[PDB]
Design an enzyme around this catalytic site. Structure first.
Site, PDB file in Angstrom:
ATOM      1  CB  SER A  93      -0.969  -0.057   1.174  1.00 35.93           C
ATOM      2  OG  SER A  93      -1.975   0.933   1.044  1.00 35.93           O
ATOM      3  CG  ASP A 215      -7.064  -3.015  -2.994  1.00 33.46           C
ATOM      4  OD1 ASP A 215      -7.561  -2.084  -2.332  1.00 33.46           O
ATOM      5  OD2 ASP A 215      -5.877  -3.357  -2.883  1.00 33.46           O
ATOM      6  CG  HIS A 244      -5.659  -2.141   0.797  1.00 32.71           C
ATOM      7  ND1 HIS A 244      -5.641  -1.530  -0.442  1.00 32.71           N
ATOM      8  CD2 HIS A 244      -4.748  -1.541   1.595  1.00 32.71           C
ATOM      9  CE1 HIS A 244      -4.710  -0.597  -0.359  1.00 32.71           C
ATOM     10  NE2 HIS A 244      -4.138  -0.582   0.839  1.00 32.71           N
TER      11      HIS A 244
END
Length: 266
Positions: A93, A215, A244
């Protein structure tokens, strides 16, 4: 001091080094299913982002962390403290952008970046699908401010995906709630309002762009945008997974993909 502040762990020896950086709301524990598969072939480095619930809140400098550059400076600092001349960096991320920013200042320190759930921009504009309209982010921030506990419980199943009562959903709501409410809100606004699209053409370090097909924070079109705009040699692999944090929630389908990208060069 840096080792202590960022809960730095070094597992293994030798030149071939791998550094894992976690995303918002979690910590180095997000790498628990991946780490077992790396320890025999690499020196593995785990660290926590300043502002993670596992870090001391007195060290959270609001101005230093107002831009993603603060996190990039921290990463370079950990690499220099450990005397790491070169590494494979795996960024989950936000850490994917932090890694990319660090590679701009120090290309010498990275032989490759493996991104997981990466995005250079979350906010939509009439020609860019980031996944979020500003009006929805405004409502997300107000919910974080109103009741942090209720937000964590509501947000964790949505972000993790899969079954709402899974171990990964329970793990993530705990790590989200470990954050001090004001840091969590400030960091959330910083990341969600970030724009790294303009720096993409300048990256020279090879990038492996991996993401779940579903996601909440990363539409599939984002991986194609990164692939098209990154100046470096890059490759995309959209995993048939939901979530995620897929390395944590769906290890059986995600870990083999990550290993291929770590083990094999473009």
């Amino acid at each position: 001091v840096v080792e202590e502040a960022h809960n730095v762990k070094v597992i293994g020896s030798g030149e071939a080094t791998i550094v894992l950086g976690h995303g918002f709301g979690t910590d180095q524990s997000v790498w628990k299913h991946l780490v077992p598969h790396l320890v025999d072939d690499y020196r593995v480095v785990l660290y926590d982002n300043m502002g993670a619930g596992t870090t001391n809140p007195d060290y959270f400098d609001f101005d230093r962390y107002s831009n993603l550059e603060g996190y990039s400076f921290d990463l370079i600092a950990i690499l220099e403290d450990l005397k790491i001349e070169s590494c494979i960096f795996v960024g989950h991320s936000v850490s994917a952008m932090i890694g990319v920013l660090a590679s701009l200042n120090r290309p010498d320190l990275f032989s490759k970046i493996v991104m997981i759930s990466a995005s250079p921009r979350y906010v939509n504009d009439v020609d860019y699908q980031g996944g979020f309209e500003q009006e929805d982010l405004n409502q997300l921030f107000e919910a974080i401010r109103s009741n942090y506990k209720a937000w964590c419980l509501g947000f964790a199943p949505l972000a993790v995906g899969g079954d709402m009562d899974s171990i990964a959903v329970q793990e993530f709501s705990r790590t989200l709630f470990n954050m001090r409410p004001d840091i969590a809100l400030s960091v959330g606004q910083t990341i969600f309002q970030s724009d790294m699209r303009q720096i993409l053409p300048f990256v020279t370090v090879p990038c492996h762009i991996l993401q779940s097909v579903k996601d909440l924070a990363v539409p599939v079109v984002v991986s194609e945008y990164l692939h098209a705009n990154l100046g470096c040699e890059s490759v995309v692999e959209v995993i048939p997974s939901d979530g995620h944090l897929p390395q944590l929630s769906s290890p059986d389908s995600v870990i083999p993909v990550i290993l291929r990208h770590i083990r094999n060069d473009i």
